[PDB]
Design a binder for this molecule. Sequence first.
Ligand code: CLA
Ligand code: CLA
Ligand code: CLA
Ligand SMILES: CC1=C(C/C=C(\C)CCC[C@H](C)CCC[C@H](C)CCCC(C)C)C(=O)c2ccccc2C1=O
Ligand code: SF4
Lengths: 40, 741, 161, 166, 163, 73, 60
Amino acid sequence: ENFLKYLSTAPVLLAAWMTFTAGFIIEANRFYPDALTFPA
Amino acid sequence: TKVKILVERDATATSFEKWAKPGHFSRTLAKGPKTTTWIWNLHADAHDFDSQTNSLEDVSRKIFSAHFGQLAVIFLWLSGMHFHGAYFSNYLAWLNNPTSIKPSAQVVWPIVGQEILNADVGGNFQGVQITSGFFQLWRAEGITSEIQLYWTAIGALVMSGLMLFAGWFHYHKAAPKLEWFQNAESMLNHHLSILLGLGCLSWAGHQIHVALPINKLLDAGVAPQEIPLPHEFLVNRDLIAQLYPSFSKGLVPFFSGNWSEYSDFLTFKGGVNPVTGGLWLTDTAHHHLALAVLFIFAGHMYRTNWGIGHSMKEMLEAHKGPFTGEGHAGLYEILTTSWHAQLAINLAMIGSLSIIVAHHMYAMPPYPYIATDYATQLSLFTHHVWIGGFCIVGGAAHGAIFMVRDYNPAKNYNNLLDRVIRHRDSIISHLNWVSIFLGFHSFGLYIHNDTMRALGRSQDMFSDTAIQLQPIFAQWIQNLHLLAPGNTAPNALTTASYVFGGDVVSVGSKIAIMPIKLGTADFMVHHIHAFTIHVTALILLKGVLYARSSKLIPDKANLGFRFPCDGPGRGGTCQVSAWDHVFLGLFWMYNSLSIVLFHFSWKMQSDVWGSVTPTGAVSHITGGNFAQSAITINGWLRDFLWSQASQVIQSYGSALSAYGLIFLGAHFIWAFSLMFLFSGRGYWQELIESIVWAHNKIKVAPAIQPRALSITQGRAVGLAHYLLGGIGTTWAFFLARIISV
Amino acid sequence: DVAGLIPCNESPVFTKRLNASVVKLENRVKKYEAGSPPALALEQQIERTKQRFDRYSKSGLLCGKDGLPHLITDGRWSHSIEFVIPGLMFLYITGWIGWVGRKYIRTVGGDTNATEKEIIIDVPLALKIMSTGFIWPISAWQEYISGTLLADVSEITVSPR
Amino acid sequence: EMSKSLPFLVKPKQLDGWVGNAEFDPFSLSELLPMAFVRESELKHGRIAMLAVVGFVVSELIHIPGEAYQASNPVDAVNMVGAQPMLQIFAFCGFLESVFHKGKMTMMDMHADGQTPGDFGFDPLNVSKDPAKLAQYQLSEIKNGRLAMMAISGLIHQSIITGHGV
Amino acid sequence: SASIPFMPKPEKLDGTVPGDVGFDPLGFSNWVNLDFLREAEIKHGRICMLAVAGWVAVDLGLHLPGDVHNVGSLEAHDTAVKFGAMSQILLWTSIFEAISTVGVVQMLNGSGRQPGYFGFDPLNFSKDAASKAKLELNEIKNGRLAMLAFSGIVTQAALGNDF
Amino acid sequence: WVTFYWHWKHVTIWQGNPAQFNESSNYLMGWLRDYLWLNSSPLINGYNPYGMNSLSVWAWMFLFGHLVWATGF
Amino acid sequence: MDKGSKVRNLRKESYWFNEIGTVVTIDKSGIKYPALVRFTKVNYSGTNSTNFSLDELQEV
Ligand code: CLA
Ligand code: CLA
Ligand code: CLA
Ligand SMILES: CC1=C(C/C=C(\C)CCC[C@H](C)CCC[C@H](C)CCCC(C)C)C(=O)c2ccccc2C1=O
Ligand code: SF4
């Protein structure tokens, strides 16, 4: 319980969520790079 | 047995319950957040153990285990460095051809086009060129293979794990009692005789048995593949006797006293190795052996359990003269009852030592092929200079903290501290006068030269072809050091460093090290250095002495170490605390070290670093424009900043583009810091009030009320961003100016 | 067309930029043996550059006198692909975020430990709320027309109002 | 009192009154989310997997004139140009999801009063005759749905690696 | 003290762990959970028993139909990582190990799970009559034997082909 | 900002290569290099060790303004 | 008005102006500001209560 509650603290969750967002953004740019504009 | 081991078993229970109660350590923060200020406080008082418990034993146990944690972090950092050398570096190719191959141990994933940062360093390898001199260090150790680097990283990881376990064990399982910590004599004996004595002895053994033969074979041109493994140099003595035909005699000369027989690999030639451009490995081996002997001897000075030894308490009490009342009576209690005093001394010494290291390493390149790596030399010098300045200012800050918190007048009656506090006014007034005198004269020399050069009166300036200010004393010292070999150091074949005088040591057509001539520009810049150092000392010493009281605030001590002010009364009372004195001293230290780094960079580029021809002609990087252009402010602005900033501004589209981006980012952060530095808290509080009204109008309102940063936090953030911006700007400038080569 | 811009499909400067990039990459790779990891990386970079330029040519962007694509953001539907479409996406995503956040604020706010639930997030409730953001526009409009979006004038203010 | 599917974990609770009570929840995601919504999602994923697996098998068997012929479905769907058909089907699926959920769109809105998971009426075949037969068929539906999810994942990925999924 | 008669009577030992004989010179158990140690020992033993069986099986026998299996045990790891079978076995063992990690945490918390309890008895060789304790002593002992034997086999085959 | 924009655009137009601004004004490094670093060369060279010219006064005032700006801090 | 009753603040200078606070105590022994009120939010000084006169409170 205590460990999960600690994982629920603001800094830990912010770090985890920002890492997740950076990860999926990086992957999206990896599979569809140089995306200046939308495909037709 | 007065010195004995005392511990408490199971001092603290291990559980995660506390991890879910942030701010548990402090009594005020344990009540939960009412406003956002709480958040900041939780990160500001995290390591302020003294303010969390009134017992010294608990603070001591926290400090010990936090030091264990720091050691674990450092070992993890070393493990990472070594692993990136083994798996992601061109260390082998650099080994084969050190001159041409550029060191690099970092690789970037190609994700957004950042793969351009993968430079064409060489050796069929692409990566970010490193400037940490790790390749030269590893070569000096005779690594010669990536398996050894891999195992070095594994050992570092295991050591980091051991440090973490030791911290946990010595807090939660076996926490030493306070009496255990208060053993200065035993601690000094153990840290001198073993940590520094046997450390030197073991490293000397390594050099004698591993680094020496391997590096000698490498200098002879043996390819790393054909060099036998280091363990092969420990089993068959003859295999080493070929290189140094003194092992054949073995250890019998050592015990018989005929140490002269070891002069083959224990030399005192000094100078620099012409092939690699670094110090002779035999010289370093003899050096470390002598240091090991001295440290082991010095580790027996203090009395621990057997009558013989020195009692530092009596030693201090004994030194008292007519001018100083009670002499050093009460300093032992101060240094064994307050961690802030010890931290102040240790930080000041570590910072000064780091600066000494920076000065000595460039003058006498200790590792092979580090002298001609201009990028490494500059990076190491500037890094260690910055570390030294930060440590010095931290020592000042913690001295002030000790004065505010751990200073007790009852135990400090008419001793040195009392008397210093009692003529602090005279000390500060005279330091102020000398600071003003130095500033006026030194900087007005530059202003005068600039004015005369602008008016066309070049014959009236303070230049070599004009009114001359020759550093005669420094030149005399250089001459004496030049003449030392054979006369005052008869057993030393060559001068300690070629800076003072002698030949031009060049490796692979690059000037590794050459004599540095001192002219009027050197005189002026040295006096500028002295001025800045004196002003920084003024600020920090004033903060320390007036930390408890002043003619403005007779009761400053009750206000604490760091507080914003004491109101707008008595005129104004802004930045009256010692913490604010540290805040200003950090700015002045940054300024002084910036001047030091500019002096070093320009002088080395214009007078030492360069190229040589087969005949012997010297061509420096900037053509020796330091003598006639370093004597005016406009000269520094034009020939140093504007001229040498071409690399950063033009680095776009190349592997150094990251340096240009960081140049701009550092400028941005430096300018951003001014927002906190100039503005005050009231404006931002009112703006936040308006923004909070806007949020509330939509039924969005955080339970944790937003608050503008406290005054002290505003200053701290401004200073932190100012320092980051300045340091990053110079970092990018130097690295791009010295990597386009 | 638009402001004297010629489509990048028939832009000589655009092709010159493509050629310059490719040729400089080729000059860089000429100092590595064929098949070496650096050579493969540089060849992949060349291929990625060619694909990027081809995609820009085929997309329909407008080039300038400098050969670089220019964006038209006056609402022109033929150029919505440049700004309007992504913008909407942003306003959706952020909208979602904002809405979700507001909901959490108004969900844990009715508790004695409301502050304690902001430093420590109630991850189950937090994810419950976060999964509901895909209908943020509808819920926002319903609250607006229902009077539950904005607070009444009876709220905190300052001496002069 | 002890787990069944994984006989080395404590039996998770809040899993009794449910058709697929095989007692499999190591990471305890059920404890992290409302059971009704997540089981309804299980039903939806299973039904979509069933439809997708049938649709992939049929396509690789027979086709529609002029809609592309004799190709792997992951490739044919790519071969659609202009997104003309896919947006139509997307809007149709949204229409039906809205009709079925009756406007209780999200999880919090969903399960307002009863909203039994995955019912949506639509049972013309004579059922609800008794809890026994109805629960038997529901358990069959869950098992077949999970099997369909795995089958469709496998078929689509095996088509990706190979040319034809089979 | 059992076996070693001059050692300091292993602490927090015996009364459990059918395989124990009282041999704890360093005595890690005193300062660490015994359940965790038992789980580690049992898992190492099982994995290594399978490893010995595989190494002897690869010894010029039972090779799979694929041509890549003409390769020997020493080169098997490299050929498998290149072939990618190794990555897949990693995937499946990782899945099993995570599901078992939940159980290890529960056991430590006090869930009452026995160290190696994975309820895996398809042919229920165990019976109340057979005596689970008697069945386990052999399990633990042959597991330790396999641990040591495989370490030796790999080392002395890296020296020279054992057979 | 306004004066920098006006001056750089007019300088590029006067030089006869307005393309330089159109190219380098889209990123900040362009402002730092092609406008400040590039156009200050005739200024900081008002007086050098080789000699001085009519602009020496302006270079002196340049350094003076820098000094006063710093003193404000 | 009474103990435990919610009152809207009307003091213009107050940090909790136009806010709801719960009455803690009322002094019937004369006094100019007898009604002690407590608010959820803490002001800039960290306090969350103040004395008001009954004229400076809207009852509910
Ligand atoms: C041996 C080294 C050492 C040790 C053990 C301490 C220990 C302590 N110091 Mg001292 N100090 C040191 C060095 C040290 N300091 C140095 C070198 C300086 C000079 C700057 C100071 C200046 C100083 C002051 C002025 C004060 C302390 C205070 C304290 C106490 C609280 C510290 C705390 O809560 O951390 C909290 C830590 C943080 C909030 C982290 C902030 C770290 C900086 C700001 C950011 C680092 C940026 C990073 C390096 C790069 C960023 C890159 C970017 C791109 C993201 C504690 C007793 C405070 C006190 O009251 O003690 C009684 C106090 O007022 N110290
Ligand atoms: C470049 C701007 C600048 C300048 C010139 C100064 C100048 C000075 N600072 Mg300041 N300071 C600055 C920026 C500057 N600071 C910034 C940015 C900070 C923020 C961190 C500080 C923070 C700071 C602190 C905290 C302290 C100083 C101190 C000092 C003094 C050092 C002693 C000295 O040199 O006296 C000599 C004066 C000069 C060299 C100024 C130039 C004068 C020239 C040479 C001659 C001028 C011509 C002449 C007067 C002609 C007269 C006629 C004319 C009027 C017509 C001096 C007054 C220290 C101090 O006052 O104690 C000693 C001190 O403690 N400063
Ligand atoms: C979910 C929380 C939330 C919401 C709904 C809003 C909504 C708004 N803000 Mg506020 N704001 C927030 C958080 C939030 N803000 C935070 C955390 C900060 C501190 C950085 C600010 C600082 C701020 C300022 C300074 C200003 C606004 C303004 C505005 C308005 C215009 C939009 C805007 O400028 O956004 C700007 C948003 C930011 C600058 C930072 C947002 C950072 C993240 C994305 C938001 C927090 C998300 C959080 C993780 C929620 C998690 C939920 C989860 C636990 C379930 C709008 C009313 C402006 C205004 O008054 O307009 C009239 C304005 O001037 N906001
Ligand atoms: C800008 C400013 C503020 C307002 C600044 C605030 C409230 C800081 C806002 C911080 C935000 C909310 C955190 C996120 C910031 C970055 C996006 C990343 C995090 C940076 C570090 C905190 C890690 C003051 O309160 C202030 C007080 C006294 C003197 C000067 C100033 C001052 O200059
Ligand atoms: S301006 Fe700020 S620091 Fe100065 S007296 Fe006023 S409150 Fe204190």
